[PDB]
């Protein structure tokens, strides 16, 4: 039995059907002045960004789902997430469908300037 | 002046009277702040807290323990201890907590009762947000409520390490005497309201630096009385100033040294470290938490 819930998929689907992208994913008031990474101990949003709290942006943890690793970590609990303020409505999404570099830290698309 | 502070502590002399309680009526009761866009109200309290605590001296040893009660919100999410993991140096210990279920950046999530959460270990600071929402069915005298605050205080004279301190959510009607009586085993203590909650009469109970006994007797029933005389006659200006200039905003790394201690060996000097927040006096095994389940079978 190959089956699993793509919860994943079913989002991505959800927005681009127009649902409204989920809410409620948590703030942070910092200085944005920080390295821009996209996932860090601490906000490190920089003037481009906004800072969320990780789990409040996982779509496994919002969603009460297991997270998609045989060891079911999550990359995102118990860390910030920076978040470009052009695509702030919607951490869930962003985080999802984006990649971060291995070499840099920062988003790929979003700050990774490694192939330049 | 006061909008440009993270929020006002009550003042000594305020803790000095002798007040009989009077219903709380503020002028601005039902105002809210502005809020920087699209901050949460939730995150712009704690932020406001944190930067007071800031101020406080507060014991920070390396492998910090914190226990976070009452930190789910509707939104099934901990926005609280979000503010508290930012500000805790990184590595912190975070344990929350709450009846209902959410998802949280802490370490450990415990959810129920907070009656049902039991550690052997000694923690380094307790916050509590916890408040009944029934609290608002108001049909007599405002009297010391038990419940979750009678959890707490026996979690404080359990649990809290010597030179370890709390900030514990109370309003005018949600409150209790003991609590307040406790405030005086603490090196020093006060009640906190935020600017951006300014309206409200919330307030965190903050006592800092734990010492195990009573530096001073207080009657908890006449300092409610004196707190909401105090706010009675001392209107706050609802302010998020503080909120925009998060510079400092990080608790510093203290490495507070953690000693083992027997009762016998807690002379005056050693209360005078705890007392300047420079010493934490607890065991320093492994953290280890549970919740109790209780087990029945609903057929037949
Ligand atoms: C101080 N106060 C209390 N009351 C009346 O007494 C009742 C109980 O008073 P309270 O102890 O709840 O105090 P207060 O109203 O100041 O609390 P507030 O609603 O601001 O709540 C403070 C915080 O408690 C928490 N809280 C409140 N309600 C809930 C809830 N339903 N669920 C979870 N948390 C809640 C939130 O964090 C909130 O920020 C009030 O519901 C009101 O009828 C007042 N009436 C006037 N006209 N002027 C006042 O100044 C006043
Ligand atoms: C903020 N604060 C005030 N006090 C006491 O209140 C005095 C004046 O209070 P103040 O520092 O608010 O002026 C201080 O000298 C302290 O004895 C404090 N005492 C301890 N141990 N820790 C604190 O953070 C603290
Ligand atoms: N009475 C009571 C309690 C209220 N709360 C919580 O305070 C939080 C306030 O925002 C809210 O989320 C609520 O669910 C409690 N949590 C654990 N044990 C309790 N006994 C309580
Ligand atoms: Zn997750
Ligand atoms: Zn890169």
């Known amino acids: ?18 649902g409204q992208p989920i809410t409620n994913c948590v703030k942070m008031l910092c200085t944005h002045t ?12 920089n003037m481009d960004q906004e800072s969320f709290g990780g789990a409040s942006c996982c779509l496994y ?56 | 002046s006061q909008a440009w502070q993270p929020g006002v502590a009550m003042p000594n002399l305020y803790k000095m009277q002798r007040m009989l309680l ?8 039902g105002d809210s702040a502005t809020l920087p866009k699209g901050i949460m109200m ?37 926005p609280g201890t979000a503010v508290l993991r930012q500000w805790l140096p990184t590595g912190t210990l975070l344990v929350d907590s709450d009846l209902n279920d959410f998802v949280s950046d802490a370490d450990s999530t415990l959810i129920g009762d907070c009656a049902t959460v039991h550690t052997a270990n000694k923690w380094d600071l307790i916050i509590s947000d916890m408040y009944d929402p029934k ?10 409520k038990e419940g979750f605050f009678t959890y707490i205080c026996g979690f404080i004279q359990q649990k809290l390490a010597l030179g370890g301190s709390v900030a514990i959510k109370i309003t005018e009607h949600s409150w209790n005497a003991d609590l307040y009586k406790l405030m005086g085993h603490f090196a ?73 201690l027997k009762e016998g060996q807690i002379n005056d000097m050693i209360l005078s470290l705890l007392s300047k927040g420079r010493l934490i006096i607890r065991e320093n095994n492994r953290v280890v938490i549970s919740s109790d389940v209780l087990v029945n079978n609903e057929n037949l």
């Open chain 2, 22 to 29: 009077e219903k709380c009526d503020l002028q601005n009761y």
């Open chain 2, 188 to 260: 020093w203590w006060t009640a906190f309201v935020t600017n951006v909650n300014a309206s409200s009469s919330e307030a965190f109970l903050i006592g800092c630096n734990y010492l195990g006994k009573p530096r001073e007797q207080i009657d908890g029933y006449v300092m409610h009385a004196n707190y909401i005389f105090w706010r009675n006659t001392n209107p706050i200006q609802l302010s998020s100033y503080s909120l925009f200039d998060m510079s400092k905003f990080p608790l510093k790394l203290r490495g507070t040294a953690v000693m083992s």
């Open chain 2, 135 to 144: 609290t608002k069915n108001v049909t007599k005298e405002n009297d010391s």
């Open chain 1, 61 to 116: 943890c919002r969603c009460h789902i297991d997270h998609p690793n045989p060891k079911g970590f999550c990359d995102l609990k118990g860390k910030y997430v920076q978040i470009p303020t052009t695509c702030a409505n919607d951490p869930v999404g962003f985080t999802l469908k984006n990649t971060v570099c291995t070499v840099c830290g920062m988003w790929k698309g979003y700050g990774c300037s490694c192939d330049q």
């Open chain 2, 42 to 78: 939730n995150v712009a309290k704690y932020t406001q807290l944190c930067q007071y605590l800031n101020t406080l001296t507060l014991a920070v040893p390396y492998n910090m323990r914190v226990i976070h009660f009452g930190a789910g919100s509707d939104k099934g999410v901990a």
């Open chain 1, 1 to 18: 039995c190959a089956f699993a819930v793509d919860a994943a998929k079913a989002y991505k689907d959800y927005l681009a059907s127009g």
């Open chain 1, 34 to 45: 920080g390295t821009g990474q996209a996932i860090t101990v601490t906000p490190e949003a």
